[PDB]
Amino acid sequence: MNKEILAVVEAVSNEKALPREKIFEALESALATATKKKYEQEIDVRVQIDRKSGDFDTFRRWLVVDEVTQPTKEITLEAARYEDESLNLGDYVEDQIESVTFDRITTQTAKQVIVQKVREAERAMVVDQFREHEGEIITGVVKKVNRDNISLDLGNNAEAVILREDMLPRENFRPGDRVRGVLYSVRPEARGAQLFVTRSKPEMLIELFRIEVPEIGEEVIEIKAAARDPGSRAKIAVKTNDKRIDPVGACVGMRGARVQAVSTELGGERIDIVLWDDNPAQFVINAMAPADVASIVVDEDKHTMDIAVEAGNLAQAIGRNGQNVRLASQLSGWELNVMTVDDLQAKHQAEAHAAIDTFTKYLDIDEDFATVLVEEGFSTLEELAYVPMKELLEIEGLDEPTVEALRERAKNALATIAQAQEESLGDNKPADDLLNLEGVDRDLAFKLAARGVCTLEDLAEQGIDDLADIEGLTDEKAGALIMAARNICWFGDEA
Amino acid sequence: MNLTELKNTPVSELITLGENMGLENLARMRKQDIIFAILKQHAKSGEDIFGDGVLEILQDGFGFLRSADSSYLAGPDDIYVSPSQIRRFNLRTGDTISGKIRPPKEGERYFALLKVNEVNFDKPENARNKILFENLTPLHANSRLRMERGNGSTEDLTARVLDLASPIGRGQRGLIVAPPKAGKTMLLQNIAQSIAYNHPDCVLMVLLIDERPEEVTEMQRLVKGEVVASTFDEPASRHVQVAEMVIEKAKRLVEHKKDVIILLDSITRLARAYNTVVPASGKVLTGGVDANALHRPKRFFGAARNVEEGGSLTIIATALIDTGSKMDEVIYEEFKGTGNMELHLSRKIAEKRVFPAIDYNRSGTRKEELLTTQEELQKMWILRKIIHPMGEIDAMEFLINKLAMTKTNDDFFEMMK
DNA sequence: TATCCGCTCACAATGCCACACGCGCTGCTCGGCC
RNA sequence: UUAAACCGGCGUGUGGC
């Protein structure tokens, strides 16, 4: 009995993978799946065999929840006065006494459970390693290639998987080659593959440099950030502490040697090494290289950067798929816009001096006063609504009638915004065909349109439950009204 | 063309060679399959092949030629030999058969040996004019084999220690008793390098049992001669397979009047492997062993003997103790009385970083007068007597000190006086 | 060189159903391709 | 690529219609 359990727990081979705690948790699960067969009532039975102290004791988990099905494990939130349960959750009991013990089929079940758990413990150890050793590039020989993933080995039963997005779109894969990658994820209690290696994630390139460039690793060239389109293009912004270091000529090597070497190691991936700057504007300027920009409009609130390249290099500035921008949009994490080609491509002198259509009636006491003022900007129209008098004194012509007209126009704007709010709040529009229906007055029509229908044809296609939660009516008058509607719409045969 | 001339070359070199021969790129198949396909292509070119392989016979009757780099294992590069040659010459297990071979057609698997050319580096008449191993007279170790290197190095220590504690001779059966973490593998490397650099006239053949793959790589390209290893990537069946390979090869080479030194480490691992491969007999003794599960290891350790008529077979084997279990202790009991040479490595001195940790008390040599001359024994005996004042730790101190100040045996002897 | 005469061998003998049964031990030879 | 299910031939004798 319990002595046999003690013998078999002291006789397990993988005591490092399956210590006594996990062994008796296995036995808990085995007794649970055994009691699943002992009684027709599918129940959970923790048994806490107390491996060190004694033998098993079948417990009946109250399994606190409002339902009743399988009532051996059904208790509501307060049925805890008896026996001193006194708890809304966690209170458990032992109703089953002298349950079935160790039939041969249950022995076979415990056997298969313990062998699959030895496997699962090997998996748990290798994934603890997977999680701790999240580090440098690792070599491995592949075993199987598929359309969605490939499988790799290192030796000593070190299985790993490289997913489709982790590979390259054109890197030919066949079972038997030594491929190198970077361990990236952590998955403690997975079911399929254990280790996860990638060759396409951005930081991979970082570590590439960290093992290639002799400068990085001693923290003289602090790599700032990087973005990557898998197997296509890797942009990377770096920052140096020393002043006599030239990362434009040191990180790449001698006429494209280090960058070219790490590109061949990547499997044919272009790389753009850029110098990181503490200014996001200058950073997004230099990141889109090779490209020149003379129109920089950076707004911090909406996270945008109007970075317009001069006309002519467009086909090279954006590139295929917008890579040179996308990676930039992934380097800083901002948004970029370029649409202008010839019509005032400055995008900063244009919008500042193109308002001849909206500023037609602003100082409409007499148009012969002065033109509009671009010193304040006159370009947001809403933060402009309330400005202090600390700058409302430089321009000439601000007589008292001017501020009186300002107040009148403020009243007009308040009235128009109130009208707009009334129009946008009344998404009901009760037409005459809705008020003319007998028994449906103005508030009833408002609510009927708030239900979701604003016409007459669809009204006849709703039940009593669709009119439930009615305010002003009740299910019998509901049925009366829906019958009148289906008569005037369907049973009337009129149009 | 030949096997080893392609196998001592790396895998990338073989891939490039196969691609140079105009073939499907072989970087997808294993190195053994690479060489197999290269040989098949060379035979397709319109010529024969000249192969070499060590011989294996199963209950079937024909012969398998295993290669050197394969650690004497089953593979596509193993050559088939029709039983007709075995009926002709009675070629037992342990011939490096060198001869002409042809490619296999459909329905076959391996190359077939046409004719015999070389039988253990000897004329095929030696295949019919020789003496078996069970019939000769085993004797004691006559020849003396110096162990010290002769450069005054820091690992020379180990060698000279043994030289002034218990030397090694041709036909000896050495058993090293050592707990874990005592400096076993570098001791194997040191003694092998010394015996192969000081005495290239004698032939070396090292056996590795249940080591790490990095240990296999560090052993295989560092010591001279064949480096046979059998790690955990093979089951106990292939363990006993390579073991029986190497033992019958050594037996046949000794029959060919050759000096064969077999390093082995450890014995408990192969004993466990054998216990794994032999079925039970209804009863289990102490430690969990069987009745006949000791007959294989016994034979394996006792195949050592000194052949006074020509050639010799010496073995240097390490054992595992202090493992917490019983079976290792009973195995050490059984193998401590069967050897004709016993040495012990201490662990308490080893964990103090004072190496080597020889047990000068339990060290011994069976019939050492046949290994040591007149005044040679005089010097050794008086030094044993003066070290005899009960000492382990400061005894190791005295030994290591007087050994570090000095370069050769005679220097130590004539400076201590 | 035709013309029977007779000797000698092939070929055949309902359809179903039901049940039962035994179709072996040991010496020798041969095969030579896991 | 993934999930579920599955994995009387012969002869003889007897008796009957």
Tab-separated table of C-alpha atoms (C1' of nucleotides) in Angstrom, chain B residues 62 64 80, chain C residues 32-34:
chain	number	residue	atom	x	y	z
B	62	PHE	CA	29.279	-13.544	-43.160
B	64	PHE	CA	31.225	-6.991	-41.491
B	80	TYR	CA	30.306	-6.944	-46.587
C	32	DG	C1'	26.756	-18.756	-47.713
C	33	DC	C1'	24.247	-10.763	-48.173
C	34	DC	C1'	22.690	-8.242	-40.605
